[PDB]
Amino acid sequence: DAGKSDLDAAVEATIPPLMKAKDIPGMAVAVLADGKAHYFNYGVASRETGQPVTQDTLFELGSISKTFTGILGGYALAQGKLSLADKASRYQPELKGSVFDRVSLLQLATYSAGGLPLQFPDAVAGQASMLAYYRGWKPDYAPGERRLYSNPSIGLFGHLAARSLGQPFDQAMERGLLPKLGLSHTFIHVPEAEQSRYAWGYAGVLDAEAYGIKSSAADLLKYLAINMSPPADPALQRALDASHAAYYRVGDMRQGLGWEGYRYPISLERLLAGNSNEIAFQPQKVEWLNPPRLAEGDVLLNKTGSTSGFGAYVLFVPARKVGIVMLANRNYPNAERVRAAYRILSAVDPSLVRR
Numbered sequence: 001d002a003g004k005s006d007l008d009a010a011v012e013a014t015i016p017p018l019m020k021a022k023d024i025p026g027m028a029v030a031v032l033a034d035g036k037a038h039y040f041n042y043g044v045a046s047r048e049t050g051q052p053v054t055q056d057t058l059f060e061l062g063s064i065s066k067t068f069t070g071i072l073g074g075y076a077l078a079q080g081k082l083s084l085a086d087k088a089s090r091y092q093p094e095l096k097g098s099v100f101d102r103v104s105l106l107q108l109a110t111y112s113a114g115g116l117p118l119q120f121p122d123a124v125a126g127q128a129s130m131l132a133y134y135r136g137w138k139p140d141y142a143p144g145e146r147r148l149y150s151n152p153s154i155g156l157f158g159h160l161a162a163r164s165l166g167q168p169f170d171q172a173m174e175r176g177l178l179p180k181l182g183l184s185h186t187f188i189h190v191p192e193a194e195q196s197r198y199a200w201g202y203a204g205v206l207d208a209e210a211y212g213i214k215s216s217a218a219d220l221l222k223y224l225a226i227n228m229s230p231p232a233d234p235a236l237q238r239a240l241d242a243s244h245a246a247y248y249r250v251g252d253m254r255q256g257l258g259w260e261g262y263r264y265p266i267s268l269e270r271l272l273a274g275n276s277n278e279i280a281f282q283p284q285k286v287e288w289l290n291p292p293r294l295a296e297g298d299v300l301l302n303k304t305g306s307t308s309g310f311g312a313y314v315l316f317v318p319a320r321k322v323g324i325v326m327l328a329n330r331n332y333p334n335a336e337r338v339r340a341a342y343r344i345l346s347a348v349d350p351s352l353v354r355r
């Protein structure tokens with residue numbers, strides 16, 4: 001009962017002040033701890049209608065979509081349909097003859113192919129211009145030398161993973177992986193029957209792979225629970241493990257497939273640094289791990305996600321069986337997401353305040 005009281009106080013001390021400071025219209029917060037889900041809902045899904053936020057309200061997840069894409073790539077790996085060390089052009093003949101004869105799937109997944117940019121140039125408006133862009137791309141760095149956070153990079157990874165499974169990505173995701181995970185309120189395209197619970201935001205080549213998932217706080221908390229306590233299917237267990245593994249380090253940050261991890265307990269300063277614009281928008285030197293590490297020691301895994309009108313954050317700590325979901329319909333600074341989540345996590349885990 002002491003832990004639940006602490007959790008309640010931490011949410012009350014963090015979320016209302018954040019929403020007031022940043023004029024956030026609505027937030028759904030969900031915390032998993034001690035085997036119980038706790039939901040904290042604030043404000044409105046729409047300023048125009050006054051519809052209240054609930055744990056079933058759908059929000060845009062932005063780049064948290066990249067963690068789903070990483071698990072899909074892990075699933076193709078688990079089924080022997082791809083290998084992370086394979087060259088990208090092996091999975092798309094139209095890429096043969098380009099630099100992607102020399103870039104690995106692992107490099108695409110981890111934004112380290114050689115300087116693929118944050119977003120596609122506007123010259124890319126569909127499949128044919130997308131292929132022409134990749135075929136004509138000239139790297140700024142040798143493969144594996146620098147991390148530059150990139151939608152074209154992990155987007156191509158997800159596209160090729162879907163090809164290895166014999167399906168368009170949207171089909172492999174919405175009609176393959178999400179049903180296998182049991183997520184019935186997680187979507188690339190929000191169906192007509194759920195539009196009434198779809199929040200409004202306040203301020204698309206490979207968009208599904210890179211930023212297109214929508215979900216509720218309840219479904220995303222179930223997703224975190226699945227990431228910590230995997231379902232029975234062995235291919236899914238291996239897919240989840242592959243997405244969580246550490247392939248390289250950037251300082252304290254451990255790059256997975258979509259997921260980003262930290263040895264735990266971790267200080268707030270290091271978690272802020274790892275989620276900073278500096279690390280996102282500048283090329284970073286990395287230290288590759290051989291082999292990749294699925295850590296025995298404690299790890300915290302997280303991901304920020306944003307769109308024009310939405311701001312989301314998730315984190316979980318498998319050893320503690322704690323997950324935190326924060327979904328908002330305004331794109332407010334990532335550092336404030338991390339700070340709030342850290343205060344909530346500190347109230348649930350005494351090993352953290354003790355530092």
Ligand SMILES: [Cl-]
Pocket residue numbers: 188189190
């Ligand atoms: Cl949609």
